[PDB]
Design a protein around this ligand. Structure first.
Ligand SMILES: Cc1ncc(COP(=O)(O)O)c(C/N=C(\CS)C(=O)O)c1O
Ligand SMILES: Cc1ncc(COP(=O)(O)O)c(C/N=C(\CS)C(=O)O)c1O
Ligand SMILES: [Cl-]
Ligand SMILES: [Cl-]
Lengths: 405, 405
């Protein structure tokens, strides 16, 4: 079992007051608060161990390089990648998807091919493929939604053919909380020789993730949603694919040689794709975040979060005129609108009560258009949120309905 | 006046021991140690103020967005840019140069044009222009060096013509410590309608920098060399140029709208060029680093550093068989080789004495080739280094010469 009270004690922001009231942070899907263990690990690195990390000769530089490669190894074990050299350090999920779209996309997707995304993708998993389809003159195909927030899987036969190079699909929707049937979709995609990129930004913090079992070709997530620092993320790529990809961002540490007359050669992956000075501070903190999450156990986190989610959905039934978007077995987030009130206003009242929710389009405008609304409210229920915080949200919505109705 | 002892007290790494001896960190040109003020500012943000920064509705998110735009304003004042919206947040100097090469380069440099770099550029200011010259079929021209480490300015007439689109030039060499005559070269480049990008990675920490007085069109530097966190840098672009540049990295926060049928539109610069979740932790720490440096005064820093440099060059005269590379009025770094010994070995012995210097090619292989060596040693003399540390370096070289000679 899992003790939310012990976990909460690790997070100094949770003591904060907003508008004179105690903060209820229900916006972890935008970014997660960090434990002291993560904050201090990064700070301690800066205080006692800092140097440049380019296999430099002196002790601090050599120890710092080792710390960074250890974090790469820890991350590969966290997602059960076969090898640590299948992981690239990127700024976050957005940069990681761009990297795949430019390096792998530009040399595997030719005119007349198609790429398949879904209608629930965040912008990070849409724009890179739009821009790519422009460049190479290919077709962006879209798996549509059902009213309950699941993919219409019956349309897959009309979307997959011999010219399908890539399926780019979200693991968990950042709005609906839908978890997609990745294992089966990957089997189908591979039957046509298509590769699969999985956007795992909203998955890695809710339950164990195993890229060997999924058999995905690419997997991305962001450190800051995983209770870690900003400025760091992970791109997993199958070794066979990764060793064939050409470079993208160019400069020091990703070259092997530079000549003004003979041109330039590049070093092996994953280092080929990490140019300039890595975000060592962020990498250190990400290592600590993975240890912290592993110490609690993702299976215990899942169990607590599922109970909190089931409690919230049960209590929200007593809010009049509340529209919920998505399936009943959602992970992490509850997207809703309250009567005909603008989500902006609902979120402003909730913030006035000290409750932080997100409003707007959630970087998922095609998802908003499918539901024929311009915006939604969204509450995230993370491992450090409490039944009492759910109660504040329910009471808050009731008050807002009564006041503005 | 400036008190190195008071300054040193702000830097917790300087107490560290290496190999059982007290650390002499002479590798700030690779990356600088950070003061407590910088470390704690970032940590405090995570502990009390953390949220996503996308003009979100709730208080923490709104205050966090404001903090980030204040740091942008502080940075523009630090380099005397006319407007805060002329600064883009990038991962560092390397990413910033790539951004210019892809966004501005791809639409202003056509086949048969030329770009001019210098022979002392770091790889970060070479590879992006090589890759670009490939794409568009243009010519990369190179300003050669004199033996003393200065540019051969007499060759400029053979390099500049009507088809010169861009001069990309370093402000201060990371190996030679040469400071280039930027103001005059920019005047010449503008007479041909060429733009100028200045690589300022090794300049911003040594003396005041004023982009209005330089009249450069682009200017880049890295936070981590400026006593700040890793994972953050600044790209300055003249407003007139920046408002015309198309996008590069695509996703959330840099779109204005996303449609699966009508395509995608982009938001205004500078935000057009900041995709995904910004490195807020790093941005906060960079703000603190700028305040800390401003509180000491760049003119006092310059004065102390120049005296330390003049002392070191004077003392190094008593090292037998020492070859120095670069001019006498160098800033920041001393590049050298000791007799016929490999720089790798010299640096290993210095690390054995607790002295951290850099060895290798310093991401400047064409500069190494000009001097017909494969590698050099380099010591950085920063604002927190002492006459006693110079003495340890001089004694160390003497011992190494006697032992290995
Ligand atoms: C499913 C998904 N894929 C990518 C990203 C971008 O991640 P990145 O910013 O690069 O770290 C997100 C970001 N989170 C958001 C979207 S704005 C939210 O608030 O739900 C995402 O949810
Ligand atoms: C003059 C100059 N321009 C760009 C960079 C890259 O900066 P970035 O890594 O992106 O922050 C550097 C890095 N510093 C080095 C080169 S390896 C050193 O050790 O002298 C530089 O000196
Ligand atoms: Cl390099
Ligand atoms: Cl967006």
């Amino acid at each position: 079992i899992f003790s939310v009270d012990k976990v909460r004690a690790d997070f100094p922001v949770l003591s904060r007051e907003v508008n004179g009231l105690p903060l209820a942070y229900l916006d972890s899907a935008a970014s997660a608060q960090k434990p002291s263990q993560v904050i201090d690990a990064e700070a301690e690195f800066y205080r006692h161990g800092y140097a440049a990390v380019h296999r430099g000769i002196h002790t601090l530089s050599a120890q710092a390089t080792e710390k960074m490669e250890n974090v790469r190894k820890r991350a590969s074990l966290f997602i059960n990648a076969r090898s640590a050299e299948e992981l690239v350090f990127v700024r976050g999920t957005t940069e990681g998807i761009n990297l795949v779209a430019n390096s792998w996309g530009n040399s595997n997707v030719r005119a007349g091919d198609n790429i398949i995304i879904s209608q629930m993708e965040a912008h990070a998993n849409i724009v890179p493929w739009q821009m790519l389809c422009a460049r190479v003159g290919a077709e962006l195909r879209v798996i549509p939604l059902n009213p309950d927030g699941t993919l219409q899987l019956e349309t897959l036969p009309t979307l997959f053919d011999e010219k399908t190079r890539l399926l780019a699909i979200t693991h968990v929707s950042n709005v609906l909380g839908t978890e997609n049937p990745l294992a089966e979709m990957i089997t189908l995609a591979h039957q046509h020789g298509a590769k699969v990129l999985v956007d795992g930004a909203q998955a890695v913090m809710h339950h164990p993730v195993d890229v060997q079992a999924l058999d995905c070709d690419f997997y991305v997530f962001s450190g800051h949603k995983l209770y870690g620092p900003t400025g760091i993320g992970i791109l997993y790529v199958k070794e066979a694919l990764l060793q064939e990809m050409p470079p993208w961002e160019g400069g020091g540490s990703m070259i092997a040689t530079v000549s003004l007359s003979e041109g330039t050669t590049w070093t092996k992956a994953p280092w080929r794709f990490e140019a300039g000075t890595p975000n060592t501070g962020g990498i250190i903190g990400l290592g600590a975040a993975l240890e912290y999450v592993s110490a609690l156990g993702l299976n215990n986190i899942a169990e607590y979060e599922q109970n909190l989610m089931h409690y919230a959905l049960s209590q929200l039934e007593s809010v009049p005129d509340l529209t919920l978007y998505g399936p009943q077995n959602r992970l992490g987030v509850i997207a809703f609108n309250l009567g005909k009130h603008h989500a902006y206003d609902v979120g402003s009242f909730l913030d006035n009560y000290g409750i932080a929710v997100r409003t707007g389009h959630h970087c998922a405008m095609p998802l908003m258009a499918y539901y024929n609304v311009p915006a939604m409210c969204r509450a995230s229920l993370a491992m450090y949120n409490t039944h009492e915080e759910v109660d504040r949200l329910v009471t808050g919505l009731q008050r807002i309905h009564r006041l503005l109705g």
